[PDB]
PDB file of C-alpha atoms and ligand atoms in Angstrom:
ATOM      1  CA  UNK I   1     137.955 136.888  39.234  1.00 19.27           C
ATOM      2  CA  UNK I   2     135.603 137.234  36.301  1.00 17.65           C
ATOM      3  CA  UNK I   3     131.934 137.489  37.261  1.00 19.06           C
ATOM      4  CA  UNK I   4     132.755 137.491  40.983  1.00 18.30           C
ATOM      5  CA  UNK I   5     130.735 139.698  43.342  1.00 18.06           C
ATOM      6  CA  UNK I   6     133.035 141.412  45.789  1.00 14.24           C
ATOM      7  CA  UNK I   7     133.380 144.174  48.321  1.00 15.68           C
ATOM      8  CA  UNK I   8     136.226 146.643  48.001  1.00 16.73           C
ATOM      9  CA  UNK I   9     137.637 148.246  51.073  1.00 16.13           C
ATOM     10  CA  UNK I  10     140.551 150.498  51.919  1.00 15.24           C
ATOM     11  CA  UNK I  11     143.937 149.441  53.212  1.00 13.94           C
ATOM     12  CA  UNK I  12     144.201 152.970  54.666  1.00 14.67           C
ATOM     13  CA  UNK I  13     141.005 152.358  56.664  1.00 16.40           C
ATOM     14  CA  UNK I  14     139.615 148.821  56.511  1.00 15.90           C
ATOM     15  CA  UNK I  15     136.316 149.982  57.952  1.00 16.94           C
ATOM     16  CA  UNK I  16     135.649 151.933  54.733  1.00 15.48           C
ATOM     17  CA  UNK I  17     134.056 150.296  51.703  1.00 15.48           C
ATOM     18  CA  UNK I  18     133.195 151.388  48.181  1.00 17.96           C
ATOM     19  CA  UNK I  19     129.532 152.390  48.392  1.00 17.44           C
ATOM     20  CA  UNK I  20     127.180 153.293  45.572  1.00 13.44           C
ATOM     21  CA  UNK I  21     125.034 156.112  46.915  1.00 11.38           C
ATOM     22  CA  UNK I  22     121.317 155.581  46.208  1.00 12.99           C
ATOM     23  CA  UNK I  23     119.526 158.157  44.105  1.00 16.61           C
ATOM     24  CA  UNK I  24     122.458 159.425  42.114  1.00 17.70           C
ATOM     25  CA  UNK I  25     125.691 158.206  40.558  1.00 18.95           C
ATOM     26  CA  UNK I  26     127.879 159.011  43.538  1.00 16.44           C
ATOM     27  CA  UNK I  27     130.418 156.616  45.008  1.00 15.59           C
ATOM     28  CA  UNK I  28     131.491 157.104  48.592  1.00 15.59           C
ATOM     29  CA  UNK I  29     133.668 155.415  51.174  1.00 14.37           C
ATOM     30  CA  UNK I  30     131.230 154.179  53.799  1.00 10.13           C
ATOM     31  CA  UNK I  31     131.098 151.946  56.862  1.00  7.11           C
ATOM     32  CA  UNK I  32     130.438 148.249  56.303  1.00  8.54           C
ATOM     33  CA  UNK I  33     126.780 147.666  55.389  1.00  5.82           C
ATOM     34  CA  UNK I  34     126.743 143.988  54.345  1.00  2.59           C
ATOM     35  CA  UNK I  35     124.296 144.824  51.551  1.00  2.39           C
ATOM     36  CA  UNK I  36     124.212 145.304  47.803  1.00  2.00           C
ATOM     37  CA  UNK I  37     125.198 149.006  47.999  1.00  2.00           C
ATOM     38  CA  UNK I  38     128.745 147.779  48.735  1.00  2.00           C
ATOM     39  CA  UNK I  39     128.852 144.892  46.266  1.00  2.00           C
ATOM     40  CA  UNK I  40     130.462 145.051  42.861  1.00  2.00           C
ATOM     41  CA  UNK I  41     130.679 142.505  40.065  1.00  2.00           C
ATOM     42  CA  UNK I  42     134.128 142.219  38.486  1.00  2.00           C
ATOM     43  CA  UNK I  43     133.776 141.816  34.711  1.00  2.00           C
ATOM     44  CA  UNK I  44     136.749 140.843  32.584  1.00  2.00           C
ATOM     45  CA  UNK I  45     137.185 141.952  28.946  1.00  2.00           C
ATOM     46  CA  UNK I  46     139.534 139.728  26.908  1.00  2.00           C
ATOM     47  CA  UNK I  47     140.487 142.409  24.364  1.00  2.00           C
ATOM     48  CA  UNK I  48     141.438 145.008  26.905  1.00  2.00           C
ATOM     49  CA  UNK I  49     142.777 142.494  29.429  1.00  2.00           C
ATOM     50  CA  UNK I  50     141.086 144.788  31.928  1.00  2.00           C
ATOM     51  CA  UNK I  51     138.034 144.842  34.145  1.00  2.00           C
ATOM     52  CA  UNK I  52     134.810 146.711  34.772  1.00  2.00           C
ATOM     53  CA  UNK I  53     133.571 147.123  38.310  1.00  2.00           C
ATOM     54  CA  UNK I  54     129.759 147.030  38.235  1.00  2.00           C
ATOM     55  CA  UNK I  55     127.490 148.040  41.109  1.00  2.00           C
ATOM     56  CA  UNK I  56     125.021 145.460  42.425  1.00  2.00           C
ATOM     57  CA  UNK I  57     122.479 148.288  42.917  1.00  2.00           C
ATOM     58  CA  UNK I  58     119.157 146.491  42.410  1.00  2.00           C
ATOM     59  CA  UNK I  59     117.372 149.590  41.060  1.00  2.00           C
ATOM     60  CA  UNK I  60     119.956 150.524  38.427  1.00  2.00           C
ATOM     61  CA  UNK I  61     121.884 147.425  37.516  1.00  2.00           C
ATOM     62  CA  UNK I  62     124.293 148.688  34.857  1.00  2.00           C
ATOM     63  CA  UNK I  63     126.332 151.303  36.700  1.00  2.00           C
ATOM     64  CA  UNK I  64     130.091 150.878  36.589  1.00  2.00           C
ATOM     65  CA  UNK I  65     132.960 152.650  38.343  1.00  2.00           C
ATOM     66  CA  UNK I  66     133.979 155.483  36.020  1.00  2.00           C
ATOM     67  CA  UNK I  67     136.756 158.050  35.848  1.00  2.00           C
ATOM     68  CA  UNK I  68     135.095 161.342  34.899  1.00  2.00           C
ATOM     69  CA  UNK I  69     137.946 162.637  32.781  1.00  2.00           C
ATOM     70  CA  UNK I  70     139.139 165.341  32.539  1.00  2.00           C
ATOM     71  CA  UNK I  71     138.378 165.745  36.253  1.00  2.00           C
ATOM     72  CA  UNK I  72     139.859 163.392  38.813  1.00  2.00           C
ATOM     73  CA  UNK I  73     136.409 162.455  40.129  1.00  2.00           C
ATOM     74  CA  UNK I  74     135.138 158.888  40.336  1.00  2.00           C
ATOM     75  CA  UNK I  75     131.462 157.952  40.097  1.00  2.00           C
ATOM     76  CA  UNK I  76     129.143 155.206  38.913  1.00  2.00           C
ATOM     77  CA  UNK I  77     127.871 155.774  35.376  1.00  2.00           C
ATOM     78  CA  UNK I  78     125.886 153.772  32.844  1.00  2.00           C
ATOM     79  CA  UNK I  79     128.060 151.060  31.305  1.00  2.00           C
ATOM     80  CA  UNK I  80     129.035 151.890  27.725  1.00  2.00           C
ATOM     81  CA  UNK I  81     132.235 149.841  27.768  1.00  2.00           C
ATOM     82  CA  UNK I  82     134.227 153.050  27.558  1.00  2.00           C
ATOM     83  CA  UNK I  83     137.970 153.126  28.298  1.00  2.00           C
ATOM     84  CA  UNK I  84     137.316 155.283  31.402  1.00  2.00           C
ATOM     85  CA  UNK I  85     135.184 152.441  32.768  1.00  2.00           C
ATOM     86  CA  UNK I  86     137.963 149.829  32.588  1.00  2.00           C
ATOM     87  CA  UNK I  87     140.603 149.116  35.205  1.00  2.00           C
ATOM     88  CA  UNK I  88     143.776 147.127  35.673  1.00  2.00           C
ATOM     89  CA  UNK I  89     143.659 145.000  38.830  1.00  2.00           C
ATOM     90  CA  UNK I  90     147.260 144.923  40.023  1.00  2.00           C
ATOM     91  CA  UNK I  91     147.883 142.707  43.042  1.00  2.00           C
ATOM     92  CA  UNK I  92     150.792 143.894  45.156  1.00  2.00           C
ATOM     93  CA  UNK I  93     152.262 140.576  46.219  1.00  2.00           C
ATOM     94  CA  UNK I  94     154.360 142.466  48.802  1.00  2.00           C
ATOM     95  CA  UNK I  95     151.286 143.947  50.523  1.00  2.00           C
ATOM     96  CA  UNK I  96     148.533 141.430  49.609  1.00  2.00           C
ATOM     97  CA  UNK I  97     146.354 144.282  48.312  1.00  2.00           C
ATOM     98  CA  UNK I  98     145.388 145.807  44.965  1.00  2.00           C
ATOM     99  CA  UNK I  99     146.258 148.900  43.011  1.00  2.00           C
ATOM    100  CA  UNK I 100     143.385 149.744  40.688  1.00  2.00           C
ATOM    101  CA  UNK I 101     144.729 151.568  37.658  1.00  2.00           C
ATOM    102  CA  UNK I 102     142.735 153.276  34.928  1.00  2.00           C
ATOM    103  CA  UNK I 103     142.782 151.487  31.575  1.00  2.00           C
ATOM    104  CA  UNK I 104     142.347 154.852  29.843  1.00  2.00           C
ATOM    105  CA  UNK I 105     145.513 156.117  31.596  1.00  2.00           C
ATOM    106  CA  UNK I 106     147.332 153.502  33.675  1.00  2.00           C
ATOM    107  CA  UNK I 107     149.573 156.198  35.190  1.00  2.00           C
ATOM    108  CA  UNK I 108     146.544 157.154  37.243  1.00  2.00           C
ATOM    109  CA  UNK I 109     145.139 154.912  39.962  1.00  2.00           C
ATOM    110  CA  UNK I 110     142.313 154.954  42.510  1.00  2.00           C
ATOM    111  CA  UNK I 111     143.056 156.873  45.695  1.00  2.00           C
ATOM    112  CA  UNK I 112     140.994 156.592  48.859  1.00  2.00           C
ATOM    113  CA  UNK I 113     140.392 160.127  50.066  1.00  2.00           C
ATOM    114  CA  UNK I 114     139.366 159.014  53.518  1.00  2.00           C
ATOM    115  CA  UNK I 115     138.765 162.565  54.751  1.00  2.00           C
ATOM    116  CA  UNK I 116     136.469 163.420  51.820  1.00  2.00           C
ATOM    117  CA  UNK I 117     135.006 159.901  51.982  1.00  2.00           C
ATOM    118  CA  UNK I 118     135.299 159.405  48.242  1.00  2.00           C
ATOM    119  CA  UNK I 119     137.644 158.191  45.513  1.00  2.00           C
ATOM    120  CA  UNK I 120     139.929 160.252  43.340  1.00  2.00           C
ATOM    121  CA  UNK I 121     142.281 159.327  40.471  1.00  2.00           C
ATOM    122  CA  UNK I 122     145.972 159.787  41.366  1.00  2.00           C
ATOM    123  CA  UNK I 123     149.620 159.062  40.464  1.00  2.00           C
ATOM    124  CA  UNK I 124     151.330 156.054  42.093  1.00  2.00           C
ATOM    125  CA  UNK I 125     153.184 156.101  45.412  1.00  2.00           C
ATOM    126  CA  UNK I 126     153.987 153.910  48.415  1.00  2.00           C
ATOM    127  CA  UNK I 127     151.027 155.051  50.502  1.00  2.00           C
ATOM    128  CA  UNK I 128     148.209 152.852  51.776  1.00  2.00           C
ATOM    129  CA  UNK I 129     145.715 155.250  50.144  1.00  2.00           C
ATOM    130  CA  UNK I 130     146.105 153.628  46.740  1.00  2.00           C
ATOM    131  CA  UNK I 131     145.775 150.077  48.083  1.00  2.00           C
ATOM    132  CA  UNK I 132     142.532 148.099  48.291  1.00  2.00           C
ATOM    133  CA  UNK I 133     141.160 144.866  49.656  1.00  2.00           C
ATOM    134  CA  UNK I 134     138.989 142.959  47.170  1.00  2.00           C
ATOM    135  CA  UNK I 135     137.049 140.093  48.750  1.00  2.00           C
ATOM    136  CA  UNK I 136     134.225 137.740  47.839  1.00  2.00           C
ATOM    137  CA  UNK I 137     131.213 139.450  49.397  1.00  2.00           C
ATOM    138  CA  UNK I 138     129.963 136.433  51.394  1.00  2.00           C
ATOM    139  CA  UNK I 139     133.372 136.019  53.030  1.00  2.00           C
ATOM    140  CA  UNK I 140     133.536 139.789  53.585  1.00  2.00           C
ATOM    141  CA  UNK I 141     130.099 139.824  55.206  1.00  2.00           C
ATOM    142  CA  UNK I 142     130.451 136.701  57.340  1.00  2.00           C
ATOM    143  CA  UNK I 143     134.133 136.121  58.122  1.00  2.00           C
ATOM    144  CA  UNK I 144     133.840 137.755  61.545  1.00  2.00           C
ATOM    145  CA  UNK I 145     130.286 138.789  62.248  1.00  2.00           C
ATOM    146  CA  UNK I 146     128.096 138.711  65.339  1.00  2.00           C
ATOM    147  CA  UNK I 147     124.629 138.051  64.024  1.00  2.00           C
ATOM    148  CA  UNK I 148     121.141 136.755  64.445  1.00  2.00           C
ATOM    149  CA  UNK I 149     119.892 133.996  62.154  1.00  2.00           C
ATOM    150  CA  UNK I 150     116.187 133.969  61.261  1.00  2.00           C
ATOM    151  CA  UNK I 151     114.055 131.754  59.045  1.00  2.00           C
ATOM    152  CA  UNK I 152     112.603 133.607  56.062  1.00  2.00           C
ATOM    153  CA  UNK I 153     109.245 132.168  57.244  1.00  2.00           C
ATOM    154  CA  UNK I 154     109.421 134.035  60.575  1.00  2.00           C
ATOM    155  CA  UNK I 155     111.534 137.183  60.458  1.00  2.00           C
ATOM    156  CA  UNK I 156     110.848 138.104  64.073  1.00  2.00           C
ATOM    157  CA  UNK I 157     112.155 134.808  65.410  1.00  2.00           C
ATOM    158  CA  UNK I 158     115.656 133.441  65.643  1.00  2.00           C
ATOM    159  CA  UNK I 159     117.744 130.309  65.798  1.00  2.00           C
ATOM    160  CA  UNK I 160     118.949 130.054  69.378  1.00  2.00           C
ATOM    161  CA  UNK I 161     120.669 127.846  71.852  1.00  2.00           C
ATOM    162  CA  UNK I 162     117.946 127.106  74.436  1.00  2.00           C
ATOM    163  CA  UNK I 163     120.001 128.262  77.401  1.00  2.00           C
ATOM    164  CA  UNK I 164     123.567 128.335  78.657  1.00  2.00           C
ATOM    165  CA  UNK I 165     123.213 124.734  79.866  1.00  2.00           C
ATOM    166  CA  UNK I 166     120.607 123.392  77.435  1.00  2.00           C
ATOM    167  CA  UNK I 167     122.578 122.995  74.234  1.00  2.00           C
ATOM    168  CA  UNK I 168     119.594 122.184  72.043  1.00  2.00           C
ATOM    169  CA  UNK I 169     118.821 124.635  69.243  1.00  2.00           C
ATOM    170  CA  UNK I 170     115.340 125.872  68.501  1.00  2.00           C
ATOM    171  CA  UNK I 171     113.282 128.816  67.242  1.00  2.00           C
ATOM    172  CA  UNK I 172     112.131 131.652  69.521  1.00  2.00           C
ATOM    173  CA  UNK I 173     111.083 135.266  69.341  1.00  2.00           C
ATOM    174  CA  UNK I 174     113.958 137.750  69.276  1.00  2.00           C
ATOM    175  CA  UNK I 175     114.764 139.099  72.700  1.00  2.00           C
ATOM    176  CA  UNK I 176     118.407 140.176  72.209  1.00  2.00           C
ATOM    177  CA  UNK I 177     119.637 137.513  74.614  1.00  2.00           C
ATOM    178  CA  UNK I 178     123.174 136.132  74.363  1.00  2.00           C
ATOM    179  CA  UNK I 179     122.008 132.619  73.453  1.00  2.00           C
ATOM    180  CA  UNK I 180     120.214 134.115  70.431  1.00  2.00           C
ATOM    181  CA  UNK I 181     123.384 135.572  68.914  1.00  2.00           C
ATOM    182  CA  UNK I 182     126.183 133.881  67.004  1.00  2.00           C
ATOM    183  CA  UNK I 183     129.642 134.969  65.913  1.00  2.00           C
ATOM    184  CA  UNK I 184     130.386 133.621  62.442  1.00  2.00           C
ATOM    185  CA  UNK I 185     134.080 132.941  61.852  1.00  2.00           C
ATOM    186  CA  UNK I 186     135.535 131.929  58.503  1.00  2.00           C
ATOM    187  CA  UNK I 187     138.262 129.308  58.421  1.00  2.00           C
ATOM    188  CA  UNK I 188     140.436 129.943  55.362  1.00  2.00           C
ATOM    189  CA  UNK I 189     142.086 126.490  55.383  1.00  2.00           C
ATOM    190  CA  UNK I 190     138.790 124.643  55.390  1.00  2.00           C
ATOM    191  CA  UNK I 191     136.991 127.328  53.381  1.00  2.00           C
ATOM    192  CA  UNK I 192     134.060 126.988  55.743  1.00  2.00           C
ATOM    193  CA  UNK I 193     132.428 128.793  58.651  1.00  2.00           C
ATOM    194  CA  UNK I 194     131.669 128.148  62.301  1.00  2.00           C
ATOM    195  CA  UNK I 195     128.867 129.679  64.316  1.00  2.00           C
ATOM    196  CA  UNK I 196     129.928 130.412  67.918  1.00  2.00           C
ATOM    197  CA  UNK I 197     127.054 130.966  70.297  1.00  2.00           C
ATOM    198  CA  UNK I 198     127.548 134.117  72.355  1.00  2.00           C
ATOM    199  CA  UNK I 199     126.406 132.561  75.634  1.00  2.00           C
ATOM    200  CA  UNK I 200     129.412 130.177  75.580  1.00  2.00           C
ATOM    201  CA  UNK I 201     133.096 130.746  74.899  1.00  2.00           C
ATOM    202  CA  UNK I 202     133.830 127.728  72.719  1.00  2.00           C
ATOM    203  CA  UNK I 203     130.417 126.427  71.716  1.00  2.00           C
ATOM    204  CA  UNK I 204     129.626 125.990  68.052  1.00  2.00           C
ATOM    205  CA  UNK I 205     126.585 125.012  66.011  1.00  2.00           C
ATOM    206  CA  UNK I 206     127.060 121.300  65.284  1.00  2.00           C
ATOM    207  CA  UNK I 207     125.361 118.510  63.369  1.00  2.00           C
ATOM    208  CA  UNK I 208     125.155 115.588  65.812  1.00  2.00           C
ATOM    209  CA  UNK I 209     125.474 113.019  63.073  1.00  2.00           C
ATOM    210  CA  UNK I 210     125.442 110.174  65.594  1.00  2.00           C
ATOM    211  CA  UNK I 211     121.794 111.193  66.279  1.00  2.00           C
ATOM    212  CA  UNK I 212     120.170 111.465  62.901  1.00  2.00           C
ATOM    213  CA  UNK I 213     119.351 115.059  61.962  1.00  2.00           C
ATOM    214  CA  UNK I 214     119.973 116.587  65.391  1.00  2.00           C
ATOM    215  CA  UNK I 215     121.693 119.957  65.762  1.00  2.00           C
ATOM    216  CA  UNK I 216     123.177 121.068  69.069  1.00  2.00           C
ATOM    217  CA  UNK I 217     125.819 123.451  70.285  1.00  2.00           C
ATOM    218  CA  UNK I 218     128.989 121.548  71.124  1.00  2.00           C
ATOM    219  CA  UNK I 219     132.515 122.433  72.187  1.00  2.00           C
ATOM    220  CA  UNK I 220     134.746 123.284  69.245  1.00  2.00           C
ATOM    221  CA  UNK I 221     136.720 120.087  68.615  1.00  2.00           C
ATOM    222  CA  UNK I 222     139.856 119.846  66.500  1.00  2.00           C
ATOM    223  CA  UNK I 223     138.735 117.397  63.816  1.00  2.00           C
ATOM    224  CA  UNK I 224     134.976 117.573  63.320  1.00  2.00           C
ATOM    225  CA  UNK I 225     133.776 118.773  59.934  1.00  2.00           C
ATOM    226  CA  UNK I 226     130.185 118.559  61.279  1.00  2.00           C
ATOM    227  CA  UNK I 227     130.981 121.788  63.148  1.00  2.00           C
ATOM    228  CA  UNK I 228     131.644 123.641  59.880  1.00  2.00           C
ATOM    229  CA  UNK I 229     129.230 125.064  57.349  1.00  2.00           C
ATOM    230  CA  UNK I 230     129.016 126.613  53.914  1.00  2.00           C
ATOM    231  CA  UNK I 231     126.992 129.782  53.436  1.00  2.00           C
ATOM    232  CA  UNK I 232     125.514 130.189  49.963  1.00  2.00           C
ATOM    233  CA  UNK I 233     123.220 132.864  48.656  1.00  2.00           C
ATOM    234  CA  UNK I 234     119.921 131.749  47.200  1.00  2.00           C
ATOM    235  CA  UNK I 235     119.956 132.150  43.421  1.00  2.00           C
ATOM    236  CA  UNK I 236     120.124 138.215  51.056  1.00  2.00           C
ATOM    237  CA  UNK I 237     118.761 134.812  51.807  1.00  2.00           C
ATOM    238  CA  UNK I 238     121.133 131.920  52.405  1.00  2.00           C
ATOM    239  CA  UNK I 239     121.315 128.189  52.712  1.00  2.00           C
ATOM    240  CA  UNK I 240     123.634 126.870  55.393  1.00  2.00           C
ATOM    241  CA  UNK I 241     125.180 123.560  54.326  1.00  2.00           C
ATOM    242  CA  UNK I 242     127.079 121.189  56.619  1.00  2.00           C
ATOM    243  CA  UNK I 243     130.659 120.466  55.576  1.00  2.00           C
ATOM    244  CA  UNK I 244     130.615 116.832  56.688  1.00  2.00           C
ATOM    245  CA  UNK I 245     127.777 116.023  54.249  1.00  2.00           C
ATOM    246  CA  UNK I 246     126.919 118.742  51.766  1.00  2.00           C
ATOM    247  CA  UNK I 247     123.519 117.224  51.065  1.00  2.00           C
ATOM    248  CA  UNK I 248     122.522 118.287  54.596  1.00  2.00           C
ATOM    249  CA  UNK I 249     121.375 121.861  55.207  1.00  2.00           C
ATOM    250  CA  UNK I 250     120.072 123.800  58.226  1.00  2.00           C
ATOM    251  CA  UNK I 251     116.341 123.213  58.381  1.00  2.00           C
ATOM    252  CA  UNK I 252     113.398 124.617  60.316  1.00  2.00           C
ATOM    253  CA  UNK I 253     111.311 121.561  61.160  1.00  2.00           C
ATOM    254  CA  UNK I 254     108.263 121.314  58.899  1.00  2.00           C
ATOM    255  CA  UNK I 255     108.401 125.033  58.197  1.00  2.00           C
ATOM    256  CA  UNK I 256     106.715 125.413  61.589  1.00  2.00           C
ATOM    257  CA  UNK I 257     107.113 128.873  63.108  1.00  2.00           C
ATOM    258  CA  UNK I 258     105.860 128.304  66.655  1.00  2.00           C
ATOM    259  CA  UNK I 259     108.181 129.113  69.502  1.00  2.00           C
ATOM    260  CA  UNK I 260     110.132 125.966  70.311  1.00  2.00           C
ATOM    261  CA  UNK I 261     110.221 124.595  66.754  1.00  2.00           C
ATOM    262  CA  UNK I 262     113.233 122.381  66.209  1.00  2.00           C
ATOM    263  CA  UNK I 263     116.242 123.524  64.217  1.00  2.00           C
ATOM    264  CA  UNK I 264     117.993 120.557  62.619  1.00  2.00           C
ATOM    265  CA  UNK I 265     119.714 119.482  59.420  1.00  2.00           C
ATOM    266  CA  UNK I 266     117.860 117.813  56.607  1.00  2.00           C
ATOM    267  CA  UNK I 267     118.274 116.709  53.014  1.00  2.00           C
ATOM    268  CA  UNK I 268     118.465 119.775  50.778  1.00  2.00           C
ATOM    269  CA  UNK I 269     115.043 120.175  49.196  1.00  2.00           C
ATOM    270  CA  UNK I 270     114.678 123.815  48.198  1.00  2.00           C
ATOM    271  CA  UNK I 271     112.030 124.575  50.793  1.00  2.00           C
ATOM    272  CA  UNK I 272     111.500 128.025  52.269  1.00  2.00           C
ATOM    273  CA  UNK I 273     112.241 126.342  55.625  1.00  2.00           C
ATOM    274  CA  UNK I 274     115.864 125.872  54.517  1.00  2.00           C
ATOM    275  CA  UNK I 275     116.450 129.567  53.729  1.00  2.00           C
ATOM    276  CA  UNK I 276     117.765 132.041  56.290  1.00  2.00           C
ATOM    277  CA  UNK I 277     118.408 135.704  56.893  1.00  2.00           C
ATOM    278  CA  UNK I 278     121.684 136.543  58.617  1.00  2.00           C
ATOM    279  CA  UNK I 279     121.537 140.005  60.153  1.00  2.00           C
ATOM    280  CA  UNK I 280     123.078 142.392  62.646  1.00  2.00           C
ATOM    281  CA  UNK I 281     121.373 142.441  66.038  1.00  2.00           C
TER     282      UNK I 281
HETATM  283  O1  LIG N   1     111.929 116.892  59.450  1.00  2.00           O
HETATM  284  C1  LIG N   1     110.788 117.569  59.100  1.00  2.00           C
HETATM  285  C2  LIG N   1     110.705 117.884  57.621  1.00  2.00           C
HETATM  286  O2  LIG N   1     109.378 118.437  57.371  1.00  2.00           O
HETATM  287  C3  LIG N   1     109.095 118.624  55.941  1.00  2.00           C
HETATM  288  O3  LIG N   1     107.812 119.144  55.812  1.00  2.00           O
HETATM  289  C4  LIG N   1     106.784 118.152  55.914  1.00  2.00           C
HETATM  290  C5  LIG N   1     106.006 118.370  57.146  1.00  2.00           C
HETATM  291  O4  LIG N   1     106.763 117.996  58.243  1.00  2.00           O
HETATM  292  C6  LIG N   1     104.805 117.551  57.175  1.00  2.00           C
HETATM  293  O5  LIG N   1     104.037 117.854  58.321  1.00  2.00           O
HETATM  294  C7  LIG N   1     103.962 117.827  55.941  1.00  2.00           C
HETATM  295  O6  LIG N   1     103.578 119.139  55.901  1.00  2.00           O
HETATM  296  O7  LIG N   1     104.736 117.526  54.733  1.00  2.00           O
HETATM  297  C8  LIG N   1     105.928 118.341  54.672  1.00  2.00           C
HETATM  298  C9  LIG N   1     106.653 118.107  53.352  1.00  2.00           C
HETATM  299  O8  LIG N   1     106.139 118.794  52.256  1.00  2.00           O
HETATM  300  C10 LIG N   1     110.125 119.577  55.367  1.00  2.00           C
HETATM  301  O9  LIG N   1     109.939 119.624  53.959  1.00  2.00           O
HETATM  302  C11 LIG N   1     111.513 119.153  55.675  1.00  2.00           C
HETATM  303  O10 LIG N   1     112.495 120.089  55.089  1.00  2.00           O
HETATM  304  C12 LIG N   1     111.772 118.833  57.121  1.00  2.00           C
HETATM  305  O11 LIG N   1     111.628 120.035  57.823  1.00  2.00           O
END
């Protein structure tokens, strides 16, 4: 869990996520944003056997979840490695969720005050309000997400199935049509994703490996790893790697941005034409 970037959401309301409020040190419980305001790096300390929870805020990069003793308020404060900035991550095996207990006083644990939309420090109990879902942020963002996929080279255009009956995949200006939207679904067993085109019921983005680099939408088929993909952030831009051959990534032909440009797979080569934005419509 060390060094992992996660989202943290509430068992009591799974639509509410820990959110670092811009402009101040506040932490709120907020709807899912799929951005850095709801991402936290888990940092393990060997001496304490406890963790810091550090905001991925790009403007102030060293804020950590902090109990503002002697109050019961929780905010994001500059990291000084203080005891009130360390937490025990206790996984309830009977609920598959976490209790997050203060290292400074482990009798007190995070409590989701869903009415106040913030966190307080509390005693333990059997309520869902002290239980949290900690998930890798890419899985959190993309495990069940209807999206548009755009090349970083042309933000106003999208990867699309050509039409309901033409299963080729190309680039075209965004028009909010069904064939231009995809539902990403994470498969836990395979630890990979499928992209279901919204104009079909069972059509997924597929590498047609029998035809070179071709990508088409095809019916989801039991045993075809070419229909699964890995989504990796670029060291919110992503490469999209095929599971059948992880040297092959989704590729905008020649970095061309004209309407009709081919979407395919290609050898991974670090080009801007292999980097993608994945966004809400
Ligand atoms: O399958 C097409 C590949 O094109 C490569 O870019 C070429 C481009 O097609 C060519 O016209 C010229 O500009 O040289 C480029 C290489 O630097 C992409 O690099 C590749 O990823 C594929 O898209």
